[PDB]
Structures are given as C-alpha cells and as structure tokens.
Amino acid sequence: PREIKTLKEFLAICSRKDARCVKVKHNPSATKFKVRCSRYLYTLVVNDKKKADKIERSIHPSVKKIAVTAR
Amino acid sequence: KFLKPGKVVIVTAGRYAGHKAVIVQNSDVVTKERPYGRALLAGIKKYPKKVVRGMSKQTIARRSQVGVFLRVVNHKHFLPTRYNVDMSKELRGKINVSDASKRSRSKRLVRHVFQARYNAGSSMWFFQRLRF
Amino acid sequence: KMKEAKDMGRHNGVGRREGSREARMPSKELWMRRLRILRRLLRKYRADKKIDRHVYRDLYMRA
Amino acid sequence: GKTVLSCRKGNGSVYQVHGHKRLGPAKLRILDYAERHGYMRGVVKSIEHEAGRGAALARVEFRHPYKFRRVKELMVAPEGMFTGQSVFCGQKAPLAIGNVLPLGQITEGCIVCNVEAKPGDRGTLARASGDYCIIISHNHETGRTRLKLPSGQKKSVPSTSRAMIGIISGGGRIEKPVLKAGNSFYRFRGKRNCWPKVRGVARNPVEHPHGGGNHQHIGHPSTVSRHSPPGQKVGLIAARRTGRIRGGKAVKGA
C-alpha cells in the first residue's frame, strides 16, 4: 500500500482506468480516501473537515463510492 | 615534482582514476575554501579509438572523436610525469571556471584544442590509453 | 511479603546460604562492574579537563 | 585357519586412504617447450596445509603458453617461500630458493628437493617434511648426475631431470613427543584406518601364526624367508641381522 502526497496526484490516480472503487473512512480526526487500483491501495489523508467534505461531495464520475462501516 | 602548466599527470583517485591530464593552472597557496594545494586539470575522459585501413571516413571520424573534463584536484590525488603538452599563455587566459557558463565555454575550447592536437599528430603518449 | 522482608535483609544468614559464595555472587561480575566504573570516571575527568593526558594514562594503568 | 590381517588389507575395503579434504596431487610443471628452451615466471599466491601431510603446499600461478588464460599449479613448498614471490622454471633460470632448474645446471655440492627420477616424472624424491638431496658429481661424458638420497644411498639420474633448490618445509616435526592416545587418534584420522595395533601373540591360533599357547610366546624363530607365501610372511622378513647394533649404523636397503 502506497500513500499519496497531493490532491492533484490523487485525482490523476482516481481517474486512472484501473481504479475499481474509492472507499471513504471517517476517523475522529482525519478522513482517508482509499483508491483500490489494480496492484496497490492508494490512501490520501485529509485533516481539514471542510476540505474533506469538499472532496467527498466533489465529482469523481464513473467510480463507485463506498462508505466504510463496521459490518 | 615541479608542477608547471603544460605538464602531464595521471589521476590516481576518484571516478577518473587512471586517466591522463594536463596542468592548466597551479596554485600552492591554501585558502579557507580549499585548505590544500591544488591544480586545475584538463584531462580526457574518452580516448580516441583505434583505426585500421579499409574503414569508411564516417567511422574514422566517429572513432577519432575525443572527450575531456575540467576540474580542480588535490595535489595528493595525481602523479606527475616528465611529458609535456604545449599550452600558451593566451590559451591559459581564455581558460577559466567561475560559473556554469564559463565552465562550459572553457570545456568546449579545451576539447577543440585537444582535437586539433590529435589531428596534427603531436604528443602521442598523451592520447594513448593506460592499461593496468 | 517475604520479598519486602528480604529487601530489609531478614532471611539471608549463614545458616540459610546453601550454594558457594561464587555461585551466589560471581567475582568476575564484580570485577567488570568495578573496572567499568573506574574507567568511566577517568574518561569524564579527562573530558572535563580536571586532569591531563599524562596523569590520565598513569591512573588508567593503576586501575 | 582364517585370513591374516596383512592380507585382508590388500583388498582395500575399509583400509583405503581418507582423501575427501585433500587438495590434489602435488607436482611440478609439465616439461614442455618453454621449459626446455627458456624460462617461465610465476607468482606464489597462497600457502596452505592439507590434511594428512606434514609439509606446506604452495599455489603458483603461471600464464598459459598458448591461450589467453591463467594456470594454477600446486607444489610442495621449500622452506623460506613467501606469498608474492616470483618463481622461475626452465633452462635460463637463476639460482635461488624455489627456482626449478636442470640438474646439469645446478652446481656440485648444492642442496635440492623435489627431484625427478626420470625426465618428466614431475618430482618423486625428497618430498617429506625436512628432506633434501645433495649433488655429488657431474659426468659430462655420459650426461648423468650422482646424488645422495635422504636414506644415504647413492643414485645416478640423467642430467636432464629437474629439481628445485632448497629444503622441504615443516622440519623438526617428529622431535615432539606425542604423550597421548588421543593425539595419535587424530594423527591417523587424516591418513587411513591402521591404528591401534594389536599384537600377534595376543591373537588366537586361527588368526595369526604367532597366536595361542598357555604363555604369550612365539614358538619358532621370528625371522622368515623371502620366499614365504602370503600369510606365512609375518615377523622380521628376510632379515640379515637382528639385535641392538653396536658400532656404526649401516644403510638399509637393497
């Protein structure tokens, strides 16, 4: 599993044709966006709640969104 | 030794160990930037190859090309020889290094002079490679 | 409870010792501890410049 | 009766040498054109110890006479050899410890080792720990040289056979007492299965000619003939003499 450093890089990865799904994990402090590509799982960690909500409500079309919950 | 400009030396340390060079400029006074005695050296990092009869002029030139380097080296890291390559005061004045532009221009000038010397056919031992 | 008593030193007498003196507390361990203590002190004094190299070497030999 | 042990050993079943840890036969260079008409120079790379042998062995590197390659040899080291030394072999060689030269070129009265009995044998005489030969005389008419072997006998060899100058290393080995059966155990574990040694008088009549009896004794003289069959040839074989020698000790051999 690899970690992304920038929102631009995250957007490029999420736009990659192999990106199967995007999972969103809500932690008590930060928000993690995990993109399941073919070989690796890429995670972007966002601290600001407002920014995180902006990205979540933003558009990443043609990619399924999953809300990670305890099952 | 007696390190004068125009003398031929052999590098014994670093990436260019075993190559031949000419003393362009010598300086034996230590400073705070360089606390040692040093010289500016103009060596060859690519020796001209071997040419035999029955070779096209294109490949002749391609294999007669040479390449150089321009660096300042500690006195302990080369060995002096008795051979000489003529360097004029005008050429030494035109050679200088203080920035990227000056370094590149001086390197091109040195390479041109060396190619001219090899074509003229003087100082053959300087252009033979050292096998060790 | 017995461990607190023994920490105060209550059940470790002549009639209770059962192994040899070196089995109970080896002498090589004591020597290594002492010599390391002395060498550490000498190095600290030399660093703090209380003593010089000439005095330090003589003390290092006698220790 | 049954077979005697000295005859059992000739099948060589569990009585063969232990050679897994050995490095190979030790021999001089091949007698070839360069050695016959000039000299070759080699450099000593390492000095090693091989199990079961008392002398040191030297690894010497030469250049192949005909191909682009390096050739490594394994000889018995003379005393004084060191790593990084230069060794010369052939006709035009100088005189120094470790050089191999023909006997016709070695001067008279010199000390040599690793001698060839026949030209090309690659060395068969004076190869144990502290041994050497002495050159006695040359005879230019017949082209032969006379030596004194380590046993004291004198032998004549062709002047074309080669020898190396010096003495074999490891001398003085048998001067130290062993003191223990464990030391002998470890000495023979590197050579072969021949220790410890039981006595014939301590065996039984079915096994040995000396065995049996109510006291431990040999009933017949222990000097046996040279024509005895195997199994009968135990004891002192074809002895010319017995007992403790008073006076000078002669040479032993044919």
Binding site: - | G14, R15, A17, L79, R131, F132 | - | S46, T83
Partner: protein, 112 residues
C-alpha cells in the same frame, strides 16, 4: 505460559531453519522463519578478503532484482578492488613501463 509448534513441515533446528517468536493482532504467539543472510561483496581472498566500501550485502533474489549502484562503485574495478589497490596498480603500471622503455632505449643506443 504458551508453547509453539513448527508450521512449514520441517522440524529440525539447523542453520537454515531458524525461527522467531511473534505475537499477532489476534493475541496468539506463532513461529515465523528467519531469512538467511550473506557476508557481502569482498576483496579477493589472496589479497586480504576485506569487505568493500559502498556495496551492500544482498542475498540471491535481492541481488538479482537490485540496481547496479548497490553492488558497484563508479571508480575503475568498481566492486572488485578497493581504492588503495587501484592506486597501487596505477602507479606500478606507469613506473614499470617507464623502466622498460629506458632499458630498451639504452640497449639500442649501445647497439647502434
């Protein structure tokens, strides 16, 4: 206290079958295999057999899959000889060739 078992179908404690004790996220103690190590790149045995500077000690697949920097240096004979050995060889080459040239020239001048 807990006790452990072998897990990889070889049950002998040799130099290649070394194990370590690990506690897992599920709160159990298991056995995991300890990988074998290598001694690294060395100078030739007849010249001293010293560990070479600038190179890494990598096992078989790691050495196969790594890059050249890890196992070599930019000097001449990089990853085979050390800097002092290279310097000694350079000086010896130059001086021997000079001696040979002088001797041959002297012989020819005596001849002519």
């Amino acid at each position: 206290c807990p006790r452990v078992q072998y897990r990889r179908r070889m049950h002998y404690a040799t130099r290649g079958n070394r194990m370590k004790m690990v506690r897992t996220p599920g709160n159990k103690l298991v056995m995991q295999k300890r990988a074998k190590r290598s001694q690294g790149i060395h100078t030739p045995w007849v010249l001293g057999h010293k560990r070479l500077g600038g190179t890494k000690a990598l096992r078989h697949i790691d050495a196969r899959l790594a890059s050249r920097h890890e196992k070599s240096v930019s000097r001449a004979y990089g990853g085979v000889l050390s800097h002092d050995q290279v310097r000694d060889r350079v000086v010896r080459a130059f001086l021997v060739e000079e001696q040979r040239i002088v001797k041959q020239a002297l012989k020819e001048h005596s001849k002519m």
